[PDB]
Ligand binder design. Structure first.
Ligand SMILES: CS(=O)(=O)Oc1ccc2c(NC(=O)Cc3cccc(Cl)c3)cncc2c1
Ligand SMILES: [Cl-]
Lengths: 305, 305
């Protein structure tokens, strides 16, 4: 029993965190096999950041311009290349702590653990979701660039995010491990704004199913809805549209609790109209959207209370 | 920017998690040097739990009755003893991954990271506080017994909790690493209830300072109060008393934001008698009490491990 926002154990990832220095700039890199991955903006000055020509800045660099530090050991850089917005530094030693890994690009609504690092040293781990506007609501300070987001499904680490920048509203933007940004963002200090954010509807529904499994039923009602009527109402509250794919994904939780997805959708429409009335759901006074349907099944028991 | 509930990197602890089997029971153990620590109830059947005589049950066991598994390796048990509610199993091999460690007993209000394990395998990491009623609001399933709570002090791991049981309300009870329970609980299948819980006041104040640092100032007011006047309000809303020690501990956050502790207390006083009025603080509609003053300074300064 109990439901917590839970991150994956960060051990396999901590053993990959290195410090990357290029001139006066210092950020974090990810050491996998004989390659160190880091944001390509490590080669820029603050004066270059407005309109950088990364290809032109990179061609002017040599392997000895990059200082890579793993704990108290200097790693020797023997090659450098760029893949989209990520810089790949070939080193002379394969990381003996390299876990079984994959590079995965995630869709909005998906969750992951972030190992926040400063100077190649892990300082904290937290759980978060890729927002529908492609930003992440992280907790990042100066020097956190290069920190990674991951999922550890079974014994394999799947890397899905690398931190690059903070937008003016305090939210964060980054890339997958192939250097492709999530969202309409660029690694430039030009004016960039995150689009209007919305609530991840399928995730709130999954969290309502988790509350039912944990014994909370006060919000349930005798109503059901069409999928279209649910969307007309939910979109008025800045909720993401619920697709037929989302309904299918909630199928196992619906089977386990005995509450059809469109029946749970009717509880949600009521919650958005009535508020909580001083009540809480799983210790929260807001509807929680950073738990996917897969997270709920993984965390929760197979017997409803 | 950003403020998240963040756990310590779990790496140093994951390297200590082992599986302990005694007959039909399987739970987790902590392997430090040549000793494996686990709950003493691992030696009990379900009938034994009703009223156990642990010394009598233990004297009937031999070293070969305990199966200890570290990854895919069988550890040889060469001795067994009991310290309060923890069983200590002497093994032939010292853990090569043993970090620098301490065993510490924490006070209610202090926070820690929990590495939830099943079959000696870490599956999740979350942050939580020792409640004033000595229970922890964890997220635990069957087989999580023996999972540990910890903090990191520079490069030293401070072990403060070992999971033993779940109370009927879904909250959890456990011991320090010396086998001494937190709270008026016993390791026995019998009726046990958690006392009425209170809010950790100094922690809410620290979380209000974190909101100010992050730009949330709507709750600030021109007013100030006294420790006497405030503690009358605190008693009335089931809040823990605020001591002069708590005021001193909040000193650095007070200096950084320019809001005196009794000035922040008058904001908390108003939040209790009037509510949030549809507003949120750090994305929350409730006053958060699971972040200590040290946690806030650490997350707003970028301390690494
Ligand atoms: C005082 S503060 O604002 O919280 O400190 C920061 C500073 C930089 C932060 C940072 N790095 C950048 O945004 C630098 C940058 C600039 C323009 C383009 C690009 Cl691709 C990168 C990432 N995360 C949190 C950050 C907090
Ligand atoms: Cl995805």
């Amino acid at each position: 029993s109990g439901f917590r926002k839970m991150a994956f154990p960060s051990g396999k990832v901590e053993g990959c965190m290195v410090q990357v220095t290029c001139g006066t700039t210092t950020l974090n890199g990810l050491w996998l096999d004989d390659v160190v991955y880091c944001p390509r903006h490590v080669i820029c000055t603050s004066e270059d950041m407005l309109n950088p020509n990364y290809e032109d800045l990179l061609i002017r660099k040599s392997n000895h311009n990059f200082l890579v530090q793993a704990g108290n050991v200097q790693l020797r850089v023997i090659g450098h290349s760029m893949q989209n917005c990520v810089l790949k530094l070939k080193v002379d030693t394969a990381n003996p702590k390299t876990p079984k890994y994959k590079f995965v690009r995630i869709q909005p609504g998906q969750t992951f653990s972030v190992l926040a690092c400063y100077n190649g040293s892990p300082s904290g781990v937290y759980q978060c979701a890729m927002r529908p506007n492609f930003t992440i609501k992280g907790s990042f300070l100066n020097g956190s660039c290069g920190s990674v987001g991951f999922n550890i499904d079974y014994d394999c680490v799947s890397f899905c995010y690398m931190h690059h920048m903070e937008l003016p509203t305090g939210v964060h933007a980054g890339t997958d491990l192939e250097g492709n940004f999530y969202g309409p963002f660029v690694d430039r200090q030009t004016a960039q704004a995150a689009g209007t954010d919305t609530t991840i509807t399928v995730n709130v529904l999954a969290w309502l199913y988790a509350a039912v499994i944990n014994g909370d039923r006060w919000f349930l009602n005798r109503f059901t809805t069409t999928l279209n009527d649910f969307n007309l109402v939910a979109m008025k509250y800045n909720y993401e549209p619920l697709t037929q794919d989302h309904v299918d994904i909630l199928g196992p939780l619906s089977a386990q609790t005995g509450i059809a997805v469109l029946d749970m959708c009717a509880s949600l429409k009521e919650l958005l109209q009535n508020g909580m009335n001083g009540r809480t759901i799983l210790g929260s006074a807001l509807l929680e959207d950073e738990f996917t349907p897969f997270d709920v099944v993984r965390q929760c028991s197979g017997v409803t209370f």
